[PDB]
Structure formats: structure tokens, C-alpha cells
Amino acid sequence: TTIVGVKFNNGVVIAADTRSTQGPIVADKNCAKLHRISPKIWCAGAGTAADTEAVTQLIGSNIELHSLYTSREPRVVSALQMLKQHLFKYQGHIGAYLIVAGVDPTGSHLFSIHAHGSTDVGYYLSLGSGSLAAMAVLESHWKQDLTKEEAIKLASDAIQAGIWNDLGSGSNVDVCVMEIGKDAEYLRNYLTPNVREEKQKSYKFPRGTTAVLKESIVNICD
Amino acid sequence: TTTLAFRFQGGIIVAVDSRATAGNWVASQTVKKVIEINPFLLGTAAGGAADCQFWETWLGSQCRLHELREKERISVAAASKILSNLVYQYKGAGLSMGTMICGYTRKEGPTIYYVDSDGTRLKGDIFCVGSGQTFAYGVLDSNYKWDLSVEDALYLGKRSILAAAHRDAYSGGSVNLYHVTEDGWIYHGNHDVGELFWKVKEEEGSFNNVIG
Amino acid sequence: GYDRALSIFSPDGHIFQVEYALEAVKRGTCAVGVKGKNCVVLGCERRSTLKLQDTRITPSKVSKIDSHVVLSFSGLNADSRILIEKARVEAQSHRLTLEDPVTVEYLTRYVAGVQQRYTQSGGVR
Amino acid sequence: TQQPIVTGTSVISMKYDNGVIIAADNLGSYGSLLRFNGVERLIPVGDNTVVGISGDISDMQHIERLLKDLVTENAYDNPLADAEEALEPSYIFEYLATVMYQRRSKMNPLWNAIIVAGVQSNGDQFLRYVNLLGVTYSSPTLATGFGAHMANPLLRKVVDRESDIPKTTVQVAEEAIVNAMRVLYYRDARSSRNFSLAIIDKNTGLTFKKNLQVENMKWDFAKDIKGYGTQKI
Amino acid sequence: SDPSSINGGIVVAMTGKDCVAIACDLRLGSQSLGVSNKFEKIFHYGHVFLGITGLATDVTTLNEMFRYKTNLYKLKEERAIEPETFTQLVSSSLYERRFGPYFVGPVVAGINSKSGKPFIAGFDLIGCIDEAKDFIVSGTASDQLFGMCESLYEPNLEPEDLFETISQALLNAADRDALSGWGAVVYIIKKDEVVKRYLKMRQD
Amino acid sequence: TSIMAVTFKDGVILGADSRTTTGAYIANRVTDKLTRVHDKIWCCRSGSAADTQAIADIVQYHLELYTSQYGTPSTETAASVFKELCYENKDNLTAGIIVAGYDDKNKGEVYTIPLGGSVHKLPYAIAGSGSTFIYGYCDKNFRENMSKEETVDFIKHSLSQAIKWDGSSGGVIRMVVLTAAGVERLIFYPDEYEQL
Amino acid sequence: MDIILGIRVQDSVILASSKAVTRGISVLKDSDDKTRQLSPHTLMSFAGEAGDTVQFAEYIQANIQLYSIREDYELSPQAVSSFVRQELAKSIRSRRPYQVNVLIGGYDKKKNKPELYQIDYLGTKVELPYGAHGYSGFYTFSLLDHHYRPDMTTEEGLDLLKLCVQELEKRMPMDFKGVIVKIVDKDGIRQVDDF
Amino acid sequence: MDIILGIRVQDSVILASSKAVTRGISVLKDSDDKTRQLSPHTLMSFAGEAGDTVQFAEYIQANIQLYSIREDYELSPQAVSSFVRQELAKSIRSRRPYQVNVLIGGYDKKKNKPELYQIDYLGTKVELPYGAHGYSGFYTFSLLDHHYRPDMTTEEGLDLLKLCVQELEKRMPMDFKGVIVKIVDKDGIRQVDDF
Amino acid sequence: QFNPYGDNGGTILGIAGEDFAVLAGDTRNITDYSINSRYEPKVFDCGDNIVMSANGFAADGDALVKRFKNSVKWYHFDHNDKKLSINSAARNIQHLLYGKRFFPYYVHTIIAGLDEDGKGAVYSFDPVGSYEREQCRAGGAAASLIMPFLDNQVNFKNQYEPGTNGKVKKPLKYLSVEEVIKLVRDSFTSATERHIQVGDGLEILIVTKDGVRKEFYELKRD
Ligand SMILES: *[C@@](C)(CO)[C@](*)(O)[C@H](CC(C)C)NC(=O)[C@H](Cc1ccccc1)NC(=O)[C@H](CC(C)C)NC(=O)[C@H](CCc1ccccc1)NC(=O)CN1CCOCC1
Ligand SMILES: *[C@@](C)(CO)[C@](*)(O)[C@H](CC(C)C)NC(=O)[C@H](Cc1ccccc1)NC(=O)[C@H](CC(C)C)NC(=O)[C@H](CCc1ccccc1)NC(=O)CN1CCOCC1
Ligand SMILES: *[C@@](C)(CO)[C@](*)(O)[C@H](CC(C)C)NC(=O)[C@H](Cc1ccccc1)NC(=O)[C@H](CC(C)C)NC(=O)[C@H](CCc1ccccc1)NC(=O)CN1CCOCC1
Ligand SMILES: [Cl-]
Ligand SMILES: [Mg+2]
Ligand SMILES: [Mg+2]
Ligand SMILES: [Mg+2]
User: What's its top-level EC category (chain F)?
Assistant: First the structure.
């Protein structure tokens, strides 16, 4: 994976590639690594795929119940605290590496969480196998007082660096923009620079090519 | 691999499969596991593909040099012992070879020698070698008689490989048949298991475990 | 190691050391071989200037190389032992690898090959 | 079988329209200890080749001696030693590549990653990599260690394929290299601020720059970062 | 002693025009020894089809488990479970055993009875969902199946054409794997009819 | 890490670098290793980031609950809670923590807690991988009852050398001043401290 | 424990189980019956780790006999095999698993059909026309592939079984001291005394 | 390779050697002769690592036959055993030792006495009235301690040997496919064809 | 401890026609998750109408190709400029490979050309020298993906004649150079999609009686 997070004027943006690997094999060419914890708190996940999904849903569930209990919109630090304490308890065995971001009544926020339960604060962050390719771009082009459109460009450029240069990352670029006072916009497949070219030949077989031994109608009804 | 060769009234039958594996990866279905050393000598190949192929090719060169020097075809015993003495020099180095040197000479008659990479050399009437040797033995032993006809012996050899090709996951592809007589070896064709299995199942009425 | 080429060609195309080795054979006691229809017989001369000999223990002129092959000779007695020994070893080595005793032609060919090797090897006569 | 003791980190390089640029910092690390600070890891061979070496420094110094000796040996009985029969980058590389692979094959490797940058006699750019395993490859941009992970991505944005080489000037190319060196100083724990840079041009020849420093760094934003999550002071 | 490759086997699922196909081999072995040539790896709960590769004892255990859970679902909900919902149930159940997992590679396939949309999905052994428009693969010849499906597949295939594509994908992949084959079954699934075909393949 | 805490005339100053590493990669170059467990009780964190955070969070919780019942805790009390966690979970922790705080009665105090979980009250303390290189320097240059400006220079020069030699240390030099006046944060950038 | 075979024919299930009990370099017993009657028309043979085998077999037997008394009814071979599989499926993820492989031969009185189930220690169940555990299969399966027919009589099944035992006695390394053969049919379970 | 026995009686030495050659789960041969004639009145049986056994046996045989031709004289069993021991004693400290255990049964024509020597792969020689290699000894030694007498005839020795083979066939785990028995006496070496 | 081997990834493919033969291979060179070169050729013209590729550990691959090229040179010197036949080349390569039986060249070797009857020939080698002539062979990282597709499309495996009740097989026939290149390109695009070590570029070398031609095609760079 390659995942990034970038702060800007009036909020925060996160992004991710869409490759899912199984050893050297690409299992999913267009998986979604951006997760919704609450309406305006989103999470980019790298590492063990089942773990990032499971841990984000569990904390997202508890955040919803907490939001209903307290009659308040949930805060990023609550998700951050609940995630890190969960991950720390499991001593790194739950392999979730997360970039947690969002807006809440306190303001806009950007954090990262590692599998062992350590958290970091920053204006720009990157995790995953292609984090070094992404961080190289972020270190080269990031500045203070980014606009919305500049942060999206920087974020997607950092993901692209991972896509092209890291074998662990590829396919498309997902983006989620969380601006203060506005609804969070989830931009699924924001860029699709890896479209499969037309095949040279159709491999549609003549009907009857496959040898059959038996046929039977299957009963699905009661 | 599965390879066999047995001695009988009408000479020697030799049968082998043609599969080659690298773990669970089926690398080839068309490997020649019988080496034609000369018009009267055959060698079978099981174990490491390179080890067998390289050293049995080498054996053929040593047998050629024998008949140049001695003006006489090498004995099956002497040929098998060249190979066994060779692999014994490499004992412990990790060679993996399960071979059978089959042939006819005037002084010996039809003869089969089992030779393997840990130095074992055995004369015998029946041998099965390879990962599916036990499956071949099961069919071969239960149907073997010395008084088999050339036609029945050829079939039993073929059927024994087929049995192993079916059950053993690391055997298959096709069956290569050979018949060795006083006049030399005779090739009896390549038989793909893809067609041979169903042909045998129907005609013989066997393989009732499989969905027909 | 002693390297000198002792056996060499002369202007007239002769290897004198090989030819002088034949003179040593000509000096040696006579030996004869006659083969019949179903047998071979090896006859050997023993010079009678040596009385007070012990014939029990004195090296016999005819030597068994294997149970089926024999070797007699004429010439230097000490030299013959070296050939006989080499031949006997090769006889056992053949049985070990070929699983069959040597033919008389093969054993001869080996012995003859040893003799030849000493005609173009350095340091040896 | 070895283990590297005193080590040198990333060597980065790229092609541009008229030649090649190569750079490497001046550090000799002893594990986590930043032991030696005056180490030159770019070694020129003649006036047309520069060999950049990372990894074990004792082995680097051995390679220096071999290259030094190669120049001497080439001069022997060679009236055209400073002309047609001068040492080419391709000759120097193939020699090293032969040695590196022979040493790995004897299970006693020179624990290094090497990049031979230069310009051939016909004006063509030469840039090729070789390492302790004897593995060789060429590319418009080449880098070792952390450079491979962080520099290459940045340098490939300038020269992504062959056709981008004529379009890249020495000004643009050097700027990218100097930027990459800064990024490596931010992020590589065994890097130093001081570095050397070499340009081999087909027109202006060999330019060897010493005692360069990473500058125009962004650190100001650090003051705003407090705690690791909740903390507000 | 690698649980996922003791028994062997494969499953593949594809989508077509208003239809889905799911197929599997019939082999069950103990490493090199072939034991059974009748071991089907595809099950169904109502109109939702589940294929499972991997350790055979877990394949059986999970089938029995999902039959259990879907039966209770139906009694309480008073309707058949849908593929999207079942996929979530499989994921939940597998991740529940996160640190002592079932050694399996399940594959969901079916058509949503409300929307009529063809649906397929795959999972790893700890329940990570792998959703796909085109195809899902699983088993000891997954690499082979990935190669076959990626080249042979095209979108919007008719049920009769889709049958040929998925069958050829399975057959040729199985023939390059020692632990897969020994027969094969293909399910063609339309909105309100399901056809099951047994394929003739080489028996080695 | 390179961390230190130094007592002086008006109170105590904590100091730290800003480098977090995974092997030789710098995961964070602007880390804040100086963390608040109470108004005027802070700590320097070295070792595992996860462990030291988890510990500091628990200590902050304990001292907040202490304050609700018994009022402001002593710096010694804070160090005791750190010790209790580090000692009792020594098998599962990699944390080198320096506790520093300002009382009005006790003035500036520094307690260092190494891996084992032992407590050591000292005039000043150094810790973290890069501390090894400045034992010689700090011993020769430390004086009791220094001024604020002298103590800042002592920490700055010390961590500058630690950073210079230790690859595992770098970035900015953060400092936190604890006196009767209040809490002051200080930062010092490479361009300044490197050429000292 | 080593050789256990099973052959389902037209009207019966035949189980053959080796008599040897070796431990070390000593054959301690040569007349061991490696089977338990679970119910009047259900028989289970077993092979595996010492102690585990009998302990498991008797535990299953006790449970099936308890069911029979409670319901005054005999469980079907299919039902018994499913119960056994589940017990082994639990076992494999226990602190100390039962290392026992079993064959369950039974005659279903409701269907009037013989049934043979092969279950390994992992809980891997398969219904088969013929089955084996351990190294036996490597010889017998290929042999039965050839000679077995589905419509065979019990007498034909015994001859087919003799053919297996002969092959094993010829090619197996260890002396397993022959086999105890038992037949399961509509009339229940009986032992062949002369084999 | 597994079972090799030897019994010295009044006027002869009797060697019994198992016929089985096993490898993996397959008995490859059941008529193997694990012995070589070193000289007309000296016989050596052998057992151990595959390949090593025959290679070593034939190497010794070649050397003894070479000696016989050279001197036109048969070496004594004592002399042959000492030669064999030295070869094994060298071997054990080689790069790759011969892992071969041997029994040397011979009839000394000068003494008119039978002689049995037991030599292991380390080069450990002992002259014995009865001997065995491998696990065989664990049964046969105690049996022979009881039943053996020094003045027994060849026929009594064969009955005593039958008693050993029976015990081994009863209690040994592996099927060794019977034995080839050979007798060494004043008249040389001969094989018992019906055992 | 020093490990003398490495994995440089990539994949190769050889197909034989009636009067021609192709040997294709991607141009990507990798170590772990990093790209070393997007264009590093590993299919070489070795003279005498023999093309060769030794995919796997590049250092061993280059060494082998270098040595075989040299073997061809000395074959000319020692045998009066005689043309090295493809069958003779294969046997020679077996001895090169087996020569290092106890410290192998970690490569899958494939050579292609024309046999002495003018017909297309492809030979494939394991790392220690076992070889076999075939109509078809894929080697390297994505060999497991490509090879079964080739069985189906080149050798018409599992394909029967429609309406013949799976009794008559699809008849074998030679493919045109145009049809073969279509299969090569589709094989490599498919392999690029699902294998991370395959991409960047595709270089095909075609061998006819006229000589050795080259064709290059772009592949996805993620
Ligand atoms: C980049 C793309 C680098 O991987 C990202 O970091 C992504 C994160 C996204 C998907 C959220 N990472 C992966 O895709 C991740 C890489 C990985 C692999 C293995 C361990 C850790 C990380 N891949 C996965 O998580 C896949 C997702 C599947 C393809 C849907 N899962 C697997 O590879 C599982 C790993 C399961 C696991 C078990 C125990 C501890 C850790 C992980 N592996 C298998 O399924 C392989 N095998 C199949 C046969 O059954 C036995 C297991
Ligand atoms: C039956 C079919 C199976 O046992 C037979 O026994 C056959 C004998 C025939 C081929 C003569 N045996 C094999 O097929 C044999 C099994 C085997 C493999 C390895 C060691 C011992 C036995 N297979 C081979 O020899 C394969 C044949 C190739 C794939 C055509 N070769 C390899 O596996 C090679 C060489 C192995 C090797 C031996 C000694 C030293 C070094 C290497 N290995 C690879 O190709 C490695 N790997 C394959 C997967 O792709 C990545 C590279
Ligand atoms: C200096 C740098 C060293 O003393 C300081 O002490 C700082 C203290 C600050 C950050 C509070 N220490 C670190 O930066 C610390 C060094 C360290 C590493 C490992 C064990 C103990 C201490 N670094 C970390 O804790 C990082 C922080 C991450 C990058 C946010 N974590 C890792 O390096 C993890 C930790 C795993 C771990 C091991 C043992 C005990 C606890 C946690 N390590 C990895 O992920 C290993 N990694 C796997 C992939 O390949 C590269 C190595
Ligand atoms: Cl931290
Ligand atoms: Mg098979
Ligand atoms: Mg530093
Ligand atoms: Mg790719």
C-alpha cells in the first residue's frame, strides 16, 4: 500500500492507492482503503487488510454509540485514543497501520497510528510500502498554507509516486476531502491512470468447446 | 515420477510416465523418461531431472567407448555398474536418481538392474521406481505372471502406470511403452492419459470410484 | 622428479634403448608357447649353471595372473615381477567393475600398454 | 562471508542531455555512530568517469586502489593512453562488474553498491549499477540504498524514460539531484548534510564539486507540533 | 505441514450478463495420495452460493456453520439471506477466529433477488472481503486461475458463453497443478434458474 | 533518541531531539518527546514510542485522578507512578523515561527511570541512544544553581553533540522550561545548533 | 496400529484391520482387534497414536450407546459418521488433539444400503466405495481402482480383500501379523474367523 | 540390510543373512544375498548403509583374491579378519566412513578349526561362538546363551539357527523375508537351498 | 550471513511456429519492492540464429548468456566456422548449467531458433541443466499465470470440436507469426495486471531464416 494525509487551510485531505496484494500476486486491482469511522472522520489503512477493516469498523461502531450517548459530533482524538489503546493491547499482532484524519467541533486534525499503538502528529504524513516514495514527494513539494486544490494535488502526487515506483502499490488514486463547516466528500477513483489496453484477440469460445458429462437443474426454491 | 520394468517369458516390458514437477507446479507433461542407450540397452529415469538426464546421457557415452575399445557390446551388468560406481563417488553430495538399466545380451539374456543415488545396485525381475511406485506395484504384482503374452504384458505395464498416474499427484501426462527382446528394444508408442483413462474405464469397466 | 628422456630416436630412426631392451630378452632363458586344439602349453628353460638351488621356494618362471590366465617371460627377472604385479591388479580391477574376468587379449593389451608407456615416459627405461 | 563495519549510505545519479550527474554524502558511519565526516565516496577515473561507491568503506578503499592501478596499467606501452586508447567508463565498469561477481562466487564479496557514471568517447552518456552480488542494471536514474526508495521517485519525475533525456538540461538535472540530497538528509538516519557532486559533460568535461551542503530546509513548522495526539501545550 | 495445501483444490467465480457462474474441482487428497474424486467444494444457502477451498475439515465445518447461521437468519428475518449480507456474515465469522483461523479460501456467488444484480466476492482466511466486478479465484492453483481468468475473461458474457470461459479457465489451471483436478463442477446461475454441469477432464 | 533534564536556580528544564526511527528510516523528524503528565510535571520519552506513550497516558490519568482527590501531586509522586508501571511490567516494556517537575517547596527536581524500572533522583539526567556520546561533556560542563540562559546553553550544546554523533538522533531540539513563572516551550533548528 | 482397510460392496461393508501391536523393536501382540461396535449395524475401525486410538473409539462407542438407550432407536451410519467427524474437528484445535484415523462401516436399515466413511484425525470425512488409512492406501487404492466393481457380492469382496492383504504382505516393510476381517450387513456385524 | 547372524559349532561356521532389501515403504527385493566369498574357506556377511555395504564387501573381496593370486596361498580367517578390521579402523576417521557391519565366518585349514569374527563399522573385532549385528542380537544372544553348546554338529547348529529365525519372525517389527543360510567347513562354502 | 543469490523478477516466453520462433521477455528489473530499471533487456541474439534468455537472478543470467555467447565463438574457431545447430546449443548449455550442479545458476533458461529442417524450435532449461524441446514455454515470475493460457491457446488443450460429444479434440495446427505475437502481447498484459514484478515494457525477438527481428511494446508501469 501507499497512503497519505495532508493538512490545508480549512481542513484535511487523505488519499490512497487501490492495489491489494497476495504475495507477488495482485488480488484486488481496485480495493477501497479509505474508511469512514464517522461522517466527518475518515481513515486510510495499510498493512494486514482484514485488520485495518476490522479495527476501523469496531472503533467506528463504538464512536457512533458514543456520539449518540453524548449528543455530540465525534472527535478525531477519540477515534485516535480508542484505536491506539486497542492496537497497543494486542502488542502489534493486529497489523493495522492507519492515517486518521477528520474535522470536529475542535477543528481539523491529522494523525497516524502504527500497529504497536504509537501515534504521531503532522501536517503531512505517509504510511505503507510506498511511504518512502510518497514522503519524498511530500518533502519536496509541501509548504505551509496550502489551499484545498493544492493539497489534493500534493496528496494525489504523493500516491502516484507510490503507484509508479513501489511494486506494493498500483492502480488508482482514492481521495477524501474533509473541510471545516462542509460535508466530507469521498472521491472514489479520483484518478484512473492505469486503464487496461484493448486486448489483441477475443477468447470467446465456440459453444460446445467444453466436454460435459452430466447436466441437472438445481433447486433453489423451497 | 512413476517408472516400472518387469521380466517375463517374452523378454522385458518397460513403462514410464511423462510428468515433471517443481513442488506442486506441474512443469511438464511430455518428458522422455526412457533413455535409449543403444539398440539393446534402455535406462529409466526418476528423481532429479537434470541428474538423471545428464548422467544417463553420460552413461551412453561410456557404453559407446566400451564397444569401441572392446569390439563388443557392453553387458547390462557392466553398464549398470558404471552408473552405480559413478553415483557412489557423489554419495552425500545430494544427487537424486532412481534408475533401472534394462537390456538384452547373449551371455546374460534379458536383465534388469535397479540403480539409485545412494549406491544401491540390485538385479531383479520386477521393479517400480518413483513417487508413484507403490501404486504401480499394487496393480502389477496382483496381475503378474511369468507366462504373460507380449500383448498382455505390454498392457499390464501400461495399465500399471495409468493406475499410478491416476492416484499419485506427482505422476501423469502420458505413458511411454517399450518392449525388449533378443533382437533389441521396440518402442510401443506414447499414450496420453487424457484419452487412455476413459478408453480403459469404458472397455475394462474399472475405475468405478470416478464419476463416469 | 627425474625427467630425462632416456628412450629417444636416433638419426636412422631407431630407439636404441628399446632395441637394447630386446638384447636383454635375447640373453634371457628360453621360453616357448604352443597351443593345441583344446589347450595351451607354456615351456620354459632353466639354466643348469645353478646347482644347490632350492626349487620349492625359487620363483617359478610361469606366473598365474588370474585363475584362467598365465604369463611366462624372457629377459630381466626383476623387471618381470613389476609387469606381473600390475597385470594381477588389473585382473582383479576388471572383475570388480565389469563383473567378469579379463579376456586373454585384454590382459595382453594392458601389459603391452604398460611396456609401451615406458618407451616414451621421462626418467624411465 | 563478511559483515560491513564502516559504511557509506546512498549514492544517487541521473542522465541529462549532454552528460551525467552523480552525488554522494561524505559520511563514514560505524553502525549508529556517525564516526567519520571527511570521507570522499566519489572517485574519478581519468577525466571522463566517476565511480560512486556505497557500503563497506574498507572495501571501497580497496576498489580505489584497483582503479588507481588500472590507470597505471593502461598507460604501460600505450602511446595513445591520453587519446584513443584512454580508459572508457564502459571498460572501468565491466572490470568492476567482473570483480564483484567473481568475489560473490567465491563467497567473499566486496560489500558495496557501485554506480559508474561517465561519458564515452563518442559522446554517449554512460550510467550503470553493480553490487556485491554482481547484479548489474542501467537506467536514466540510478540510486543505491535509501536513494533507491526516495531519490529515484523524484529523479524519475524529471527523466521518466529515454526520450526525456534530451529535454533535460544540466541546470534542471543538478537541481533535482541537490533536492534529492536534501530529502535524504531529512529521512535517512545514516546520512550527513555535507556531500560531493560530480558532473561529467561531453562538452565541458569533468566538474568535481566538494564541500556542498544541504540548504533551504523546512523546519519552522516543527514549533506548531505539540504532543502526539491530545496534548495542547 | 501447510494446512492450505494438504488436501488441495480450487474454486473460481465469474460474472456475466444478468448471470453468475461458480465452479470447483472434485479432488480431495492427502498430499500426493488422491483419496476422493467426489469432494464438492460449492454449497448453497437459498440462492446464495458459497465455494470453499483449503483444509477440507474446515471446508466441511464452515459449510455446516453457514447452514446453521443462514437457517436461523431465515427464521427470524422471514426471508432468504442475500449475497451482499452473506458476504458480511462470512467476513464476521472468519475474523472471529483471527488468532486461530480456519485455513480456507471462501468465495461467495449469487444474484440479489431484489435488485437482480450479479454479485461475487472472495476472502482470505481471516475474513478480508475481496469484491470484484469480473472474477474471483481461490485454491492451490490460484496463480494459474488468475492467469487464465485475466486473459480469457470479457464483460457481459451470455450464460452459455460464460460457461465455456469459466470451464476453460478452471480446466487448464487445474492441469498445471498437481493437487487440483480429478473432475470438476460448474454452476450457471440465472435470476430464477440454476444449471449444474459436471465437466470431463483428464484424471491425473 | 537523545533526551535530558537539568535542574537550575529557578527550576528545571527538559530537553530532547525530534527523531523517530524505524531501522535507518526516519518515520518522524519533528517528534515531540517532551510530554505533559501534569501542569508542571513533564517527562522525556526514550525507547519504544508505543510503550512510552501508553505509559505517559496512564500516568497522566493517575495524576489527574490524584489531583481530583488530594490536590497537586509532588514530582516524586509522579516518578513513583512511572516506576510502578515500568518496574511491574519490565518484561514487556522498552521505556527509558526522565521525569522532571517544579514544586514551590522542592523547586526543580529530576528523576530518571532506566529500563529496569529503578528510580534515581539526580541534579541532571541524560538518556537515550545519543546520551552515550555526551557523558564526558555533560559531566565536565554541568554546574548546580545555573541560570536559565546557562542551562539552555548547556542543554543546547549537549544535545547538539549527541545529535552530531548519534544517527538515531536529529531534527530540532525541543525544550520545556519549568519555573514558578509558568511553562515555556523552546525550539532550536539545525542551522543554529549544528554550527555550535 | 497401522493397516486398516474398508470395502463397500452391493449388500455389505467389509472392514479389515491388522492384528500387530508393535512398540519398539518388539511385537507385543499379534491378535489385536482394532475395532469397536458403535451400534448393531455400525462398526468403526481405528488406527493412530498409542492410547489415543482405544480411548477415542470407546468414548464414541459410549456416546452412541447412550443415544440408543435414550431414544430406543439406532442412529444411521451417516448420522454416526457426522457425530464422529465433529468430535475430531473439535479435537484438532484442542490443547492435545486425538491423533486417530477411523473407518466407519455401517448398514443403513432405512435405505437398505451399505455405507463406508473414511475420517482422518483432522476431521476430514468422505463416503467411499473403498477406503484405507496410513501407508496401506498407497498400494490398495490403485489395486481396487482396477479390480473393484460396484455390484460385487460379499464373497467377491472378500476375495478382493485377500488380493489387497497379499499385496501388502509382499511389499510392506513391517510385519503386521495378518488382519481381522468383519462384515456389516442387514443382519448386523459378524467376524470372519478363518482369514 | 538388517539381520545377519553367525554360529560357530564343532566343525563349521554357519551364517544366516536376511533376504529383504527395503527402501521407504517398499520391499524392492526379497531374495538378496548379503554375503561375499573372500576365499574358498572364508565367507563375509554384511549389513549397514545402502551402497556402502556392497561397495565395501567387494573391495575386501578383490583385495583378498589379489593376495591369493600373488602368493598362491589362502590367508587364514584370523588374517583376513585383521585386514578387514584395519580397513574399517582407517575408514571411521575418513571424510566419509564406511557404515558397514560384518561377520566373517571361516575354516582355518592349518588349525582344522572353524572361526567366527564379528566386526562393526568402527573396526571393533571380536572372535565369538555366536554373533549378530543390529537389533537381531537383542533376541538371539540370550536365546543362544541358553541353547548353544560348543560341541554341536552342523545339523544341530541349523536347528539352533531355525530357533533364532522363528523368534525374530515372531517379535521383530519388520518383515525381513526369511534368510539365506550358508555353511563354511573343511570342504569349503555351500548354501542351504531349503530354509 | 551472506546470501549469494537474489531475485531480479521478470518473466519470459517462447513460442515456436512452422518456419519461425519467438522469444519474448519483459524489460523490468527489480529487487524486493523497488524497480531498478524499466528497460533492462534480458533476451539476447547469441549468433547462428539462436536467441537466449536466462531469467531469475540476473547476475547468474548474465554470466550464463555471456558464457554461451563465448561458447558459440569458440565453436566457430575449433570447427571451421560451422553453424551451431539449436539442438547442439541446447546440449552445450546443459553442460554449462550442470557444470555448476553444486552451486547452481539460479535461472530458468529458454533458447529459441530454427532446427536443421528449418522448423521453429524452443528449448527450456531448469537451473541445473535438464532440458526439453517444446512448442511452448513460459518462464520466470509469472510463468504460472502465462503457461496454462499457452496450453489452452497454442496446444489447444481441453478444447474439443463442438457437437462431437467431447470425443474429437480440436486439431493441432501451426500458428502464424501474427497470431503468435497477439498471444504474446495478451499474455504479458495479463501477467502485468496480476503480477507486481511484471511490467514497464515488452521486448520480442522473432527468428526466421532471414535473421533476427525485434519488436517492442509498452506495458503498464505501476
Ligand atoms: C499494500 C498494497 C502492500 O500490501 C497495502 O499495505 C495493503 C493494505 C490494504 C489491502 C488495506 N496490504 C495488503 O494488501 C496485504 C499485504 C499483506 C499480506 C500479508 C500480511 C500482511 C500484509 N494483503 C492482505 O492483507 C491480503 C488481502 C487479501 C488478498 C484479500 N491477505 C493476505 O495476503 C493473507 C494474509 C492473512 C494474514 C494472516 C495472518 C497474519 C497476517 C496476515 N494471506 C493469504 O491469504 C495467503 N494464504 C492464502 C491461502 O491460505 C493461507 C494464507
Ligand atoms: C516424478 C514426476 C516427480 O518426482 C519424477 O520423479 C520426476 C523425474 C523426471 C523429471 C525425470 N522428477 C521430477 O520432476 C523432479 C522432482 C524433483 C525436483 C527437484 C529435486 C528432486 C526431485 N523435478 C525436477 O527435477 C524439476 C524439473 C523441472 C521443473 C523441469 N526441476 C527442478 O525442480 C529444478 C532443479 C531442482 C534442483 C535440483 C538440484 C539442485 C538445484 C535445483 N528447480 C527449479 O526449477 C526451482 N524452481 C522451480 C519453480 O520455479 C522457480 C524455480
Ligand atoms: C531514539 C530514536 C532511540 O532510543 C529514541 O529513544 C526514540 C524514542 C521516541 C520515539 C519516543 N525511539 C524510537 O524512535 C523507537 C526506537 C525503537 C525501535 C524498536 C524498539 C524500541 C525502540 N522507534 C519506534 O518505536 C518506532 C516508532 C514507529 C516508527 C512509529 N517503531 C518501530 O521501530 C517498530 C517498533 C516495534 C517494536 C519492537 C520492539 C518493541 C516495541 C516495538 N519496529 C518495527 O516496525 C520494525 N520494522 C519492521 C519492518 O522492518 C523495519 C523494522
Ligand atoms: Cl513519540
Ligand atoms: Mg496424478
Ligand atoms: Mg544525527
Ligand atoms: Mg505490474
Answer: hydrolase
Q: Supply the CATH number for residue H77's domain.
A: 3.60.20.10
The CA distances from residue B18 to B175, E29, E141, I128, in Å, are 7, 21, 21, 19
Query: What is the CB neighbour count within 10 angstroms for residue F4?
Result: 29
Q: Copy the grid coordinates of residue I158.
A: 481441453
Query: G28 to chain E nearest CA, in Å?
Result: 30
Q: Which of F133, F109, F90 minimizes the C-alpha distance to F2?
A: F133
Question: What pairs with residue F46 in β-bridges?
Answer: F96
**How far are the Cα atoms of A113, B5, B182, G23 from residue B106, in angstroms, in the given order?**
83, 20, 8, 50
Closest to I55 in 3D by CA, of I107, I92, I100: I107
Q: Does E177 touch chain B (CB under 8 A)?
A: yes
Domain I1-222 fold is Glutamine Phosphoribosylpyrophosphate, subunit 1, domain 1 (3.60.20)
How far is Cα of residue I206 from the mean position of the Cα atoms in its chain? 11
3-class secondary structure, H161: helix
Closest Cα to residue D69, out of D95, D49, D94? D95
| Structural domain B1-212, CATH architecture | 4-Layer Sandwich (3.60)
State the architecture of E1-204 in CATH terms. 4-Layer Sandwich (3.60)
Separation between Cα atoms, residue F98 and residue F178, nearest integer Å: 14
Q: How far apart are the first and last CA of chain H?
A: 19
Packing angle between helix A148-165 and helix A131-141, nearest 10 degrees? 140
Please provide the CATH number assigned to the domain covering F1-196: 3.60.20.10
C-beta neighbour count of A41 within 10 angstroms: 26
For chain E, list residues whose CB is within 8 angstroms of any CB belonging to chain A.
44, 46-47, 95, 98-99, 122, 124, 126-132, 142-143, 146, 151-152, 154, 157, 160-161, 163-165, 167-168, 171, 187, 192-201
Residue type, A142: W
For residue F32, the chain A residues in CB contact (below 8 A) are 121
**Can you tell me which residue has the cell 447461521?**
E69
> D162 φ, ψ to 5°?
-60, -45
Where is chain A broken, named by the residue before each break, C–N > 2.5 Å? none
**Structure-block grid coordinates of residue A208:** 460446445
| Ligand 2 pocket, CB under 6 A | B 1, 19-22, 25, 27-28, 31, 33, 45-49, 52, 96, 130-131, 170-171; I 104, 126-128, 130
Q: Which of C76, C62, C82, C97 is nearest to C25 (CA)?
A: C76
By C-alpha distance, which of H7, H35, H11 is closest to H107?
A: H11
Could you tell me which of B151, B153, B167 has the C-alpha nearest to residue B17? Answer: B167
Query: Which residue of I lies nearest to D110 if distances are taken between CA atoms?
Result: I2
**Cβ contact, residue pair F27, A120, below 8 Å:** yes
**Chain H residues whose beta carbon lies within 8 Å of the beta carbon of residue G140:** none
Residues with CB under 6 A from ligand 3: A 114, 116, 118; F 1, 19-23, 27, 31, 33, 45-50, 52, 94, 128-129, 168
What fold does the segment set A1-222 form as a domain?
Glutamine Phosphoribosylpyrophosphate, subunit 1, domain 1 (3.60.20)
Whether chain I has a CB inside 8 Å of the CB on E173: the answer is yes
Q: Which protein residue's CA is at the shortest distance from atom 51 of ligand 2?
A: I140
Which of G77, G67, G84 has its CA nearest to residue G13? G77
CA A168, A170, A175: angle at the middle one, nearest 5? Answer: 115
| Chain Cα centroid distance, residue B49 | 14
With b for 16 or more beta-carbon neighbours within 10 A and e for fewer, the B57-93 pattern comes to eebbeebeebeeeeeebbbbbbbbbbbbebbbebbee
Chain A hits for B212, Cβ within 8 Å: 213
For residues G131 and G103, is the Cβ–Cβ distance under 8 A? yes
Indicate the SS3 state at residue B76. Answer: helix
Method: X-ray
Query: Distance (Å) from the C-alpha of residue B129 to the closest C-alpha of chain H?
Result: 9
